[PDB]
Each structure stands twice: as C-alpha cells, then as structure tokens.
Amino acid sequence: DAEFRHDSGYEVHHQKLVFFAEDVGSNKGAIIGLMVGGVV
Numbered sequence: 001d002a003e004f005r006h007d008s009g010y011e012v013h014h015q016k017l018v019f020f021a022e023d024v025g026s027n028k029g030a031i032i033g034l035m036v037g038g039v040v
C-alpha cells in the first residue's frame with residue numbers, strides 16, 4: 001500500500017506573465033513560397 005503525500009514541489013500563487021492555460025495555435029493550411037528555377 002503506497003502513502004501519497006504533498007509537502008514541497010511548486011508554490012507560485014501570482015504569476016508575473018500573461019498565463020493562458022490553453023493550447024495556442026492558428027489553423028492556416030496554405031502558405032506562400034514560389035520557387036521555380038530550372039527543372040521543378
């Protein structure tokens with residue numbers, strides 16, 4: 001039988017940064033990049 005205890009780890013109440021608890025990432029799809037030299 002394992003005894004679970006929490007005493008020392010991470011103790012930070014006010015964060016000095018914009019703390020967004022969400023996965024930030026825009027769905028773009030198509031990106032610009034025209035490269036046609038000799039044989040493409």
Ligand SMILES: OC[C@H]1O[C@@H](Oc2cc(/C=C/c3ccc(O)cc3)c3c(c2)O[C@H](c2ccc(O)cc2)[C@H]3c2cc(O)cc(O)c2)[C@H](O)[C@@H](O)[C@@H]1O
Pocket residue numbers: 012016
């Ligand atoms: O030290 C770098 C800057 O730290 C900032 O505080 C910080 C120091 C550290 C953590 C310090 C840590 C230290 C030793 C160690 O063995 C382990 C972790 C972390 C901070 C801020 O926010 C992170 C945070 C807090 C709450 C969450 O729910 C999630 C993340 C935390 C964090 C944790 C982590 O697992 C990995 C990280 O890269 C960051 C200060 O405000 C700045 O002044 C300082 O320049």
Ligand SMILES: OC[C@H]1O[C@@H](Oc2cc(/C=C/c3ccc(O)cc3)c3c(c2)O[C@H](c2ccc(O)cc2)[C@H]3c2cc(O)cc(O)c2)[C@H](O)[C@@H](O)[C@@H]1O
Pocket residue numbers: 026027028029030
């Ligand atoms: O998939 C990640 C691994 O593969 C490779 O990257 C990649 C980075 C990114 C895209 C990066 C992106 C970045 C910024 C941004 O604003 C927008 C899009 C994407 C990859 C691979 O394949 C996706 C792909 C390619 C052709 C298709 O016909 C369909 C999908 C593409 C993709 C597009 C998308 O609209 C949404 C996605 O989640 C992924 C790299 O080797 C590494 O990043 C990594 O190993």
